Amino acid sequence: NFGQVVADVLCEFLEVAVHLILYVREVYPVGIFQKRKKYNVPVQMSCHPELNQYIQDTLHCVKPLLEKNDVEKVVVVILDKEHRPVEKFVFEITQPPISSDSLLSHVEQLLAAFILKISVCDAVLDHNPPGCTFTVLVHTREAATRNMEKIQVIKDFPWILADEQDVHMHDPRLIPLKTMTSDILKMQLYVEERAH
């Protein structure tokens, strides 16, 4: 039944990680971010209300699909000014299907390490051309009608199917940051980065 608590845990995590990525990749100016501590790590978090709302609407809508485990990967895509994908932060997900105490805090211990990898990830990636936008993509496991239904959870925040233009990146080179395993969660974060 744990479907919902892992979804809980992951959503709290992806919010942290998304914010940090927008900061570290400089998709938004230093100045709307405020220093915070999460999983006991120094992080940044926008306090621009609409950006925050945006990121939240997204995670709120994904949540139920995590609960039933239909999401295969969640990907944050940085786009150049021509709307061509420059790089993607790929969170590949598994939820293996029971429990003896403090499992959750061990899981957050492991996620902390992802947050760090993100915060020192300029060391391994080439910087983007300026005027980059970003977007979120949710790759479902199954191509399923049911998926569209459970994702349409806020009117005023619809989802559509992606185009080839949203996903095609020519010649990707791969930069893994972090992998983890546990009884409840298996996840890896790698970056797919455009070649030139």
């Binding site: 977007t135 790759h139 998926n147 199917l161 992606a162």
Partner: peptide
């Protein structure tokens, strides 16, 4: 290439609308 990829219709706020502070 298939359609198991979902996307929000709405765009995140532009760099400009932020600098609107």
């Amino acid at each position: 290439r298939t359609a198991n990829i979902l996307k929000p219709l709405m765009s995140p706020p532009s760099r400009e609308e932020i600098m609107a502070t």
